[PDB]
Amino acid sequence: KVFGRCELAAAMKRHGLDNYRGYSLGNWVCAAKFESNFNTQATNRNTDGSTDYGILQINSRWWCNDGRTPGSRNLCNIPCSALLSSDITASVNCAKKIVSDGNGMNAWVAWRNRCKGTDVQAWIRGCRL
Amino acid sequence: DIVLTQSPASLSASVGETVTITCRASGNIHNYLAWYQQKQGKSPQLLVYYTTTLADGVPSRFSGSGSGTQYSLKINSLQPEDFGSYYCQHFWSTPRTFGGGTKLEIK
Amino acid sequence: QVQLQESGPGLVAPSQSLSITCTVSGFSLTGYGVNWVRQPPGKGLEWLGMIWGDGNTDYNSALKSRLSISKDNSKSQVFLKMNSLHTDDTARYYCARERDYRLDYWGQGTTLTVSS
User: Fold this and answer.
1) Cβ separation of C109 and B43 shorter than 8 Å?
2) Chains in contact with C, counting 3 or more C-beta pairs less than 8 Å apart as contact
3) Which of A114, B27, C21, C44 is 20 to 30 A off residue A49, Cα-Cα?
4) Strands B19-25 and B4-7
5) Under a CB-based contact definition with an 8 Å cutoff, are residues C80 and C19 in contact?
6) Chain C residues with CB inside 8 Å of A22's CB?
7) Sequence-distant (≥ 6) Cβ neighbours of residue A108 within 8 angstroms
8) What are C71's strand-pairing partners?
9) Which residue numbers of A belong to the known binding site for substrate?
10) Which residues in A28-124 belong to E strands, given as ranges?
């Protein structure tokens, strides 16, 4: 599934991401745009046996287990293919584990380099919510 | 431009009273509203952002509420250091604007 | 330790353009916006404008034609330039850091008086 920005925003707000640890909703939609380009089936192989999965590109060495990455910690305690769903619940619940405090969105390199410091609210203005 | 109407202009209160300050927006600001305290001769200091969230270090006797277009700051059992001016500010697109201010003074 | 400090001329005649500097420390200007706010003597706060981490600027509707904000990321400085000065521009001017739609750190302000 490739989401539209408003539809992803509404689904993210329903799963408790609006102002989660002080982060406004637009941050989360801007991160998904630059990480997966809003695709739930997005995958990225890295220069190490890790692969990043789904809408928020969650890493197979640390957060989900794919049974293929050397060293899997699996801290979200989830199989990586569960994150490739058109429903984003699993992906949001793991993201909430990753963001333990008000500086946790630095876990996504694209958010830090491309969203942080810009008008991320522009991604949700005019969406019904 | 969304304008904010803040009231009252002044409140006289004793220590230990609870008081409420309101800001009404001329258009929906979608919860992007913040409150600041300004002590005599000091910089404004952030108290509350996104309508309800206390800034780090603000005591829990401050609480914010509101939705759409009317918003409130309530101060329960106010203390000697709470006297000063209070301002609301919205952050829905640009330009941003401020409420006119409420002076909280000793009774 | 996040610090913002304003420096300005103090007194100006209408024939000058105002330039005020905000020197920051403890954070990068690429990751945060800086807003400029003023407060006339015994009056409330007035928003003037901002510059985002990415360099885009947005201004107060009424004052946009007289204002210009820019920054030098390596010097860690933000500049407010104002021209066509009027005596109602007499105020304390403040820069404040914006972090995700709240102004969490404020400078002390600089006082400016506009003369004849």
Assistant:
1) yes
2) A, B
3) A114
4) antiparallel
5) yes
6) 100
7) A31, A35, A56, A57
8) C78
9) 101
10) 43-46, 48-53, 58-59
Q: Are strands C110-114 and C11-12 parallel, antiparallel or unpaired?
A: parallel
Tokens standing for residue A35: 């990480």
CATH of domain B1-107: 2.60.40.10
**Binding site membership of A: which residues?**
101
Structure tokens at C54: 């990415």
Asked if residue B32 lies in contact with residue C101, where contact means CB atoms within 8 angstroms, the answer is yes
Of the listed A18, A48, A52, A87, which one is catalytic? A52
CB contact (8 A) between residue B101 and residue C44: yes
- CATH assignment of C1-116, among 2.60.40.10, 3.50.50.60, 2.60.120.20, 3.10.129.10: 2.60.40.10
Joined together, the tokens standing for residue B98 give 């401020």
What residues of chain C have any CB closer than 8 angstroms to a CB in chain B?
35, 37, 44-47, 49-50, 58-61, 94, 96, 101-104, 106-109
Compute the distance between CA of residue B95 and CA of residue B20 in angstroms, rounded to an integer.
Answer: 27
The answer to whether the beta carbons of residues C25 and C3 sit under 8 Å apart is yes
The two structure tokens encoding residue A100 = 């333990």
Residue B82 CB neighbours (<10 A):
18
Q: How far apart are CA A78 and CA A84, in angstroms?
A: 11
Q: Domain map of chain C by residue range?
A: 1-116
Report how this structure was experimentally obtained: X-ray
> Distance (Å, rounded) from C-alpha B1 to C-alpha B11?
28
Domains and CATH numbers, chain A: 1-129 (1.10.530.10)
Q: How far apart are CA A93 and CA C36, in angstroms?
A: 38
